[PDB]
Amino acid sequence: ASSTAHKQQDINHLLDKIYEDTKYPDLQEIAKNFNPLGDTSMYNDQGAAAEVLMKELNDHRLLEQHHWYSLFNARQREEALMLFAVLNQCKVWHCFRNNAAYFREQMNEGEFVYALYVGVIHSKLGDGIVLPPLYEITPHMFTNSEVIDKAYSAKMTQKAGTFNVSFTGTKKNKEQRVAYFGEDIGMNIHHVTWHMDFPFWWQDSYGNHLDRKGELFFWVHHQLTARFDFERLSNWLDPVDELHWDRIIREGFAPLTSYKYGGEFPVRPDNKHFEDVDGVAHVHDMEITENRIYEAIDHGYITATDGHTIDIRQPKGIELLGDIIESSMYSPNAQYYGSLHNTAHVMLGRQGDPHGKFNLPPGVMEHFETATRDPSFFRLHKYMDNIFKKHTDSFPPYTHDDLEFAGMAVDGVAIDGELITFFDEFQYSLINAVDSGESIEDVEINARVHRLNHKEFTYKITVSNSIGSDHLATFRIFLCPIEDNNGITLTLDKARWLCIELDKFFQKVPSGTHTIHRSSKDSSVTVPDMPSFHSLKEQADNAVNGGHDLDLSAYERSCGIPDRMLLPKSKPEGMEFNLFVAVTDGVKDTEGHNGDHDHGGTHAQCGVHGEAYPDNRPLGYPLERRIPDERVFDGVPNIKHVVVKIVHHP
Amino acid sequence: ASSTAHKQQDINHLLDKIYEDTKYPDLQEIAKNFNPLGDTSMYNDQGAAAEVLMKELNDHRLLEQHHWYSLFNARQREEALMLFAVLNQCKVWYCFRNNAAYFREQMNEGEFVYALYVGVIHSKLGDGIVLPPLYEITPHMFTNSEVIDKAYSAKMTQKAGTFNVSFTGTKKNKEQRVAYFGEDIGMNIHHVTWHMDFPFWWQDSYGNHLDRKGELFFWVHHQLTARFDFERLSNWLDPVDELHWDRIIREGFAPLTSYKYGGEFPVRPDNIHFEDVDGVAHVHDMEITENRIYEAIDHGYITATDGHTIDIRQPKGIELLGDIIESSMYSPNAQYYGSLHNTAHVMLGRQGDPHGKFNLPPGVMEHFETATRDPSFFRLHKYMDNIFKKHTDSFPPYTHDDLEFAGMAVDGVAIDGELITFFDEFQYSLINAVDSGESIEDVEINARVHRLNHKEFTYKITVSNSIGSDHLATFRIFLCPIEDNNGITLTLDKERWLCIELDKFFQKVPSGTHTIHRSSKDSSVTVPDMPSFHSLKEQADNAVNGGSDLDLSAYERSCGIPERMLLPKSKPEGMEFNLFVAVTDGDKDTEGHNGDHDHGGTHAQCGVHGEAYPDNRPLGYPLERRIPDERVFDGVPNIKHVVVKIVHHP
Ligand SMILES: *[C@@H]1O[C@H](CO)[C@@H](O)[C@H](O)[C@H]1NC(C)=O
Ligand SMILES: [Cl-]
Ligand SMILES: [Cu+2]
Ligand SMILES: [Cu+2]
Ligand SMILES: [Cu+2]
Ligand SMILES: [Cu+2]
Ligand SMILES: [Mg+2]
Ligand SMILES: [Mg+2]
Ligand SMILES: [Mg+2]
Ligand SMILES: [Mg+2]
Ligand SMILES: [O]
Ligand SMILES: [O]
Ligand SMILES: [O]
Ligand SMILES: [O]
C-alpha cells in the first residue's frame, strides 16, 4: 500500500494529464468520497492545516482551475502552501495520497503540481519516489509556442509526431548564441528543483532545518552566473553587465513561449528603464532595499527588529545575508530588509506591462521553470552576486598558514581523455500539453531538442602525503578563465570570481605518493538527465501489476547542474582554461558529518537530502576571499592549477 | 457553369478550409490537370500574365504555404498581384475558376485569398458573387488568441462549442472603453473591403479607372477618425491626439491575437518614441516625406518628376494629394513624395521589434483586417487627416451664393423613432481556423461577440420647393457634436471637421411643401452584416441542386460602415447632437451622370461598383471648407440643423 511501487504509481497517476479531471477510477472515487476532515487522527496537527484549506475551498476563495500560476504571486503561493501544509502533516501514505487526489480535482493545477512536488520532497513519506520531469508534466513551461502549436495540430488531426525545437530570436540577435544555456530543459529543472529543495517560504516548524540555506542560495546563483559568463566567453561575447535600478536594461527578450492557460509570455523591449509595477513595488523601493542591505554589509552587522546588532563578521555572516537578501523566512527582519531578490524577479518579469493595462500574464522571470530563458536573469543575478561579493571581499585575504594542509602536496594534475563538447538530441513527451477527447485514443507527440554535451574524462591528481598516516582530504576542483574576451590575461584575483565549480569530494589519501582518479561522471556538482515520465509509468506499473518491489534507488535527485553541461561549450578552435585543484583537510572540513558516510551525488550545491551540509568551509573555498598577492597561493603545496584545453565539435 | 449559383458555389469551395489542400475532388482534378499556359485565347492579354506567374512558380520564387502574409510587404504583394493579374485577364468563368483552383494549391494562402477577393471584385466575371466574410475564411485575423485556443481545444477533443469574445485589455485601460469600435468584425471588413475596392496598387491598365480614388481615400479615413472620436466623446474620453514622428506614441497596445502561422501579433509598449525600422524607413525619412507633401500643399502645386508644376488649387487637388499621400500608383512622382501613409502603417506595426532582433511577425497595423484594432491607428490617421485639412482649409469660405439652392427651403428636420443604441450578440464560425484530419468529422465551433447596434428610425425632412417645377435634390445628412468632452459649446467651424456622415441621397422634390422620409436602414453610408459562410454555402448548394437560378441581388457590398454602427454609442444619460441637413442642387451635383438612377447602397464612401462617383461635389460638402462666419450658413434656407438626443441602453 505504501510500498515504493504503489507510491510511485500514485504520484504518476496524480500528475498524468494534469489539465483534465483524473481518468483513473480509483482517484475519481477518492476525490468524490474522501473527506480531509473525516478523521483528523491521520494528521500530526490533528487537522489544523486541513481545516484551513477546507474553509478556503468551501468559501470559494481559491484560484480556479485552468489559470496561470506563479510562485511569486503571494496569494497563489499561500494557496499552494495550504495544500503542502496538509500533505506535510499526513502521518501515513493513504492520507497523503487521498488528500492529493481530493485536492487535485478542486485546486488550480499549477498550485497543485507545486504543492505535490514540495510535499513529496519534504515529507519522509516521499522517500524513494522519483518525481517525473516537469517538462513532461507541464510542457508549456519548457517548450516554445511554435512547437506547442505543432503539438496542438497533431492532436487536432489525430496524428502522432516528433517536432524539432529551435531557439528563439534570429541570428541577428547575438544573445541567441548562448540560448542553449538558459533554455536547456535540464538546467531549468536544476533551477526549479534547487528552489523546491531550499524554498524561501520554508519555516522550521514544518519539520526540519535546511542547513546553510542562505549561503547555498548565494552559491548556486553565483555558479549559474559564472557558468553563463563562461558560455558568453565561448561565443565571442563579453560578460553580462549587472542590472541597476537607475539604468537601462539593455537586452530585451521575446520568449516566444505561452502558458497553457493565460496567453503568451510577455516580451520586453531592448533598452528600457525600470518602471514602477503596480501592486509589487516602486523602483525606488528596490533602491532603498539595496541600500539597507549594503548598510548591513558595510556595518558588519544586520539590524534586528528591536535595533540590536547581529554580527556578520563571521562564517555564518554570508548565510544571514542570504536569508535577508532572497529573502527567506529565516530573515531576522523582513519588515526592514524586505525581499530584494524575489521582488526583483517580479519587477523584471512585469516590465512588459508594469501597470497592468494590457492584461498580460506574468513574465518568464516569475517562474523558476522559465526564469533562466530570459537574458536579464543573468544581469539581475550578477547584480545580486556583487552584493554578496562586497561582503566576501571584506575579509582578510587568506595566509599561507590559513591554506596549508600540512604534509599534503599536489604534485601533479592531469586529465585522462580529451575535453570535447558537442550537441546531441534529446526527446520528451508533449502529451500532457494537449487536450484529450472523451473516449478517443492518445497519440504519441514528442519534442526533440538539441542540447550541449561532453565526452567522459578522468581527473588524475597525484598527491604526496608526508604525514605519518593516511588522512581524509577534500578535493575541490574549479575551472577558471585565463584570458577575457579581449585577449587580456587575468590575474588570479580577477579570475577567481569567474571560476566555476566542477567537483568536490572527500577521499582518504594514504601515506606516500599516489594518483587519485575521479571520473567526470561522478561530479558532486552534476546529476544525470531525468528518467522520462513514460519510463517511470512503465516501471511502476510493472511492479504493481506483478507484485514486485520497485527499486528506484539508482536514480539521482533532479537538483544539480546537468551532467551534460559540466563543461562550457568552448570554441571549435579550442580554448585554454586553468584547472584549479585545492586539496584541504577533510577531517576539519567534514567534522561532525563523517568522512565515510554517503553524501549523495549532488552535495556541492544541492546539499544532502535530510542531512546537514557536509563541508564546514565557506562555499567557494578557497577562492571566496580576495587574492591580491598570488605568491600566497603559489607557496601552498596543496593547491595547484594547470592549463587544459576544451574543444567544441560542431 | 457561368451561372451565379455555380460561380458562388465555386468561390465557396475555393475558400473552404483555406489552410489545407482542397477537399473538393473536382477542384483537385483541376489543380492537377489544368494548364494555365494551355490556351492563350482564354485571356485578354494573349496569355502574358499566366506566363509571368508560371515562371515565378517554376523558378521556386513564390512564398511558401503556411506562412504569414502582409499586403504591405512588397514582394508578397507582387506575388498576390501576379495571380490577380491572371484572374483579371480571364475572358470566361472556367478560366477564372481553373486558374484559382490551380494556384490555390501552389501559392501561399494569404496571397491566394487576397488575389481571389480582388479578382472577384474587379472582374466582370465576379458580378453577382457575394464574398464570404473574411472573419470566417481566416478567423485568426479577427479573433483573439484566447478564443482561438478554445476552438483548438474543441477540435482536439472533438466537441462542438460556442465561445464568448470579450474585448482586449482590462478595465484599468481607458482605451478599452472604445474597443467595440476598432475591434468590431464588421468595421474591420468595411476597412479591408474599401481597400480591396480602391487598392493603392491599382493601375488603369488593369481595365478601368477608379473615379476620385485619392479623394475617397481622404474621405473614408476622415470618417473613420471622426467616428472613433465620437465614440471617445460618448465614453468620457478626450479626442485622439495626432501622431508626430518626433514625439511619443502615448497609447500602446497588446493585440492578444495570433496569426494562424507566424506566431502572436507583437505588443507595443506605452509611451515609446519611434525607432528606425530596418528594411522599411528611418523615422527621419517620414519627417522629410511629410515636409515634401506640406510643401506641395502650401505651394498650391505638386512638383512633377521633371520639375514642372501640377496645379492643386482646383477641385481635383484633394484627389491628387490623396494619390501622393497614400501613396497609390496614380502618384505623379513617387520618387520624390514616397508613400507616407503606407510606410507609416509598417513603421507603426514594427515598433515592437523595429530591428528584427526578436523575429516577431508584422504588427496589426500591417493588415487592413486588423489595423483598426490598434489605438495608434486613429492617432496616425488623425495626423494624416490634418495634412489633408491644411489643403481643404486653404480655399476661401463658401459664400451665400455658393451654398444657396434657390427656391429650396428646409422647413423642418425631425426623426420618427427614438435614437437608441445597445449591444447585442453576433456569432461566426471558427471552423476554418482549426485543423481537420483525414476522415475526421467537422464539429461546429463558433465565436460569439457583443456588437454595438441601434434601433431603426426615419428622417422626416420637410422641404418647400418654390422654384416652379419639380427638382432633383441631394440630401446630405451629418451628425455633429454640440459640446466637447470639457462641456465647451463648439462653434460651427469647430464642429464641422468632427461631423460624421450619416446619409447622402438624391430625390426629386415636387413643387410646394412636402416631407421627405428616409429610413435609417437605407443609408448610403452603411451596409448590413455579411451573410455567414454557412448561409452562402446553403443558398449556393440549394440553387445548384435542383436547377434553381441562384439570385443574391438582395445582398449588398461589404464596403460600408456596418448598419449597426450608424450611430455613436452615446451615454445612458443621453447626449444631444446637432443633426445637420444640407439640401443641394441635385442637377448640378449629378451633371454628367444620372441622378435618379440606382447608385447602390454604399455610394457615400464606397462609390458605385464599375461606375463613376455619382456626386460631383467635393467629399464632405458643404462642411469641408472653413466657416469663420456662421451667419453665412444661417442665411441659407436649404441648410438646417436641429438638436437630437441619442440614448444608450446598457
Ligand atoms: C456566453 O454568453 C452567453 C450569452 O451572453 C451566456 O449565456 C453564456 O453563459 C456565456 N458563457 C460564459 C462562459 O460566460
Ligand atoms: Cl407631404
Ligand atoms: Cu533561483
Ligand atoms: Cu533568482
Ligand atoms: Cu485604410
Ligand atoms: Cu490607413
Ligand atoms: Mg552526481
Ligand atoms: Mg604561501
Ligand atoms: Mg496545400
Ligand atoms: Mg518614407
Ligand atoms: O533565480
Ligand atoms: O532565484
Ligand atoms: O488605414
Ligand atoms: O489605410
DSSP string, B249-311: B---B---BB-SSS-BPPPB-SSB----BTTTB-HHHHHHHHHHHHHHHHHTEEEPTTS-EEE
Whether B557 contacts chain A with CB within 8 A: no
Whether A263 contacts chain B with CB within 8 A: yes
Whether B272 contacts chain A with CB within 8 A: yes
Q: Please give the DSSP secondary-structure letter assigned to residue A527.
A: E
Residues 6+ apart with CB under 8 A from A412: A460, A461, A462, A515, A640, A642
Q: Which ligand is nearest to the CA of B372?
A: 13
| Residues A426-454 as b or e (16 or more Cβ within 10 Å = b) | bebbbbbbbbbeeeeeeeebbbebebbbb
DSSP string, B184-234: -HHHHHHHHHHHHHS-TT--GGGSS--TTHHHHHHHHHHHHHHHHHHHHHH
Return d(Cα A505, Cα A461) in angstroms, integer. 12
CB B411 within 8 A of CB B287: no
Residues 6+ apart with CB under 8 A from A602: A524, A525, A526, A527, A556, A557, A559, A560
Residues 6+ apart with CB under 8 A from B606: B193, B194, B197, B216, B220, B557, B559, B560
CB A88 within 8 A of CB A50: no
How are beta strands A309-311 and A301-303 bridged, if at all?
Answer: antiparallel
Enclosing H/E stretch for A585: strand A575-585
| Ligand 1 atom nearest residue B450's Cα | 5
Give CA separation, B628 vs A55, B494, B501, in Å. Answer: 71, 9, 21
CB B267 within 8 A of CB B308: no
Preceding amide of A622 cis, omega within 30: yes
Whether B273 contacts chain A with CB within 8 A: no
CB B415 within 8 A of CB B576: no
Say yes or no for a CB contact (<8 Å) between A359 and B153. Answer: no
Neighbours of ion ligand 7 (CB under 5 A): A 601
* Among candidate residues A280, A278, A286, A291, the one with its CA nearest the CA of residue A247: A286
One-letter amino acid at A103 equals F
The CATH T-level fold of domain A168-394 is di-copper center containing domain from catechol oxidase (1.10.1280)
Find chain B residues with C-beta within 8 A of A172's C-beta: 355-357
CATH 2.60.40.1520 location in chain B: 395-424+452-529+549-650
Find chain B residues with C-beta within 8 A of A254's C-beta: 353, 358-360
CB A276 within 8 A of CB A282: yes
* Among candidate residues A312, A346, A351, A343, the one with its CA nearest the CA of residue A325: A343
Distance from CA of A450 to the nearest CA of B (A): 20
Question: Which resolution in angstroms does this entry have?
Answer: 1.6
Q: Please give the DSSP secondary-structure letter assigned to residue B564.
A: G
Q: How was this structure determined?
A: X-ray
| Residues B269-294 as b or e (16 or more Cβ within 10 Å = b) | bbebebbebeebbeeebbeebbebbe
- Cβ neighbours around A172 below 10 Å, total: 12
* Among candidate residues A39, A31, A33, A26, the one with its CA nearest the CA of residue A91: A39
Find chain A residues with C-beta within 8 A of B269's C-beta: 269, 272, 352
Chain A residue nearest residue B148, CA to CA? A263
**Angle at A622 (CA atoms; ends A298, A606), nearest 5 degrees:** 90
Return d(Cα A424, Cα A449) in angstroms, integer. 8
CATH 1.10.1280.10 location in chain B: 168-394
* Among B156, B172, B275, the residue to mutate for chain A (most A Cβ within 10 A): B156
Strand arrangement of the beta sheet that strand B458-465 belongs to? B408-416, B458-465, B512-519
One-letter amino acid at A12 equals N
Return d(Cα A498, Cα A500) in angstroms, integer. 6
Residues 6+ apart with CB under 8 A from A180: A167, A231, A423, A450, A451, A452, A569
Backbone dihedral region of A43: left (phi > 0), alpha (psi from -120 to 50 degrees) or beta?
beta
Say yes or no for a CB contact (<8 Å) between B155 and A156. Answer: yes
Say yes or no for a CB contact (<8 Å) between A438 and B355. Answer: no
Return d(Cα A67, Cα A258) in angstroms, integer. 12
Neighbours of ion ligand 2 (CB under 5 A): B 514-515
One-letter amino acid at B48 equals A
Q: Residues lining ligand 1, judged by CB closer than 6 Å?
A: B 164, 425, 448
Return d(Cα A462, Cα A413) in angstroms, integer. 6
Residues 6+ apart with CB under 8 A from B283: B245, B246, B274, B275, B276, B347
Residues 6+ apart with CB under 8 A from B438: A157
DSSP string, A440-455: -----EEEEEEEEEE-
Return d(Cα B358, Cα B348) in angstroms, integer. 16
CB B600 within 8 A of CB B579: no
The alpha carbon of B648 is separated from its chain's Cα centroid by a whole number of angstroms, namely 26
The length of chain A, given as a count of residues: 650
Preceding amide of A436 cis, omega within 30: no
Phi, psi of A109, deg, nearest 5 = -65, -35
* Among candidate residues B15, B27, B18, B17, the one with its CA nearest the CA of residue B132: B15
Enclosing H/E stretch for B162: strand B161-164
Burial (Cβ within 10 Å: 0-12, 13-18, ≥19) of residue A32: exposed
Q: What would the grid cell of residue A520 be?
A: 567526470
Find chain B residues with C-beta within 8 A of A153's C-beta: 435
Enclosing H/E stretch for A582: strand A575-585
Say yes or no for a CB contact (<8 Å) between B145 and A359. Answer: no
Give CA separation, A420 vs A186, A453, A649, in Å. Answer: 20, 9, 7
Whether B66 contacts chain A with CB within 8 A: no
Burial (Cβ within 10 Å: 0-12, 13-18, ≥19) of residue A208: exposed
Say yes or no for a CB contact (<8 Å) between B157 and A353. Answer: no
Q: Please give the DSSP secondary-structure letter assigned to residue B617.
A: S
One-letter amino acid at A328 equals S
**What proportions of chain A, in percent to the nearest 5, are helix, strand and coil?**
40, 20, 45
Strands (E) in A383-484, as ranges, are 408-416, 419-429, 445-454, 458-465, 471-481
Return d(Cα B533, Cα B521) in angstroms, integer. 23
The alpha carbon of A269 is separated from its chain's Cα centroid by a whole number of angstroms, namely 27
Residues 6+ apart with CB under 8 A from A619: A212, A215, A216, A218, A219, A318
- Cβ neighbours around B238 below 10 Å, total: 12
Q: What would the grid cell of residue B317 be?
A: 487637388
| Residues B186-208 as b or e (16 or more Cβ within 10 Å = b) | bbbbbbbbbbbbbbbbbeeebee
**What proportions of chain B, in percent to the nearest 5, are helix, strand and coil?**
40, 20, 45
CATH superfamily of B395-424+452-529+549-650: Hemocyanin, C-terminal domain (2.60.40.1520)
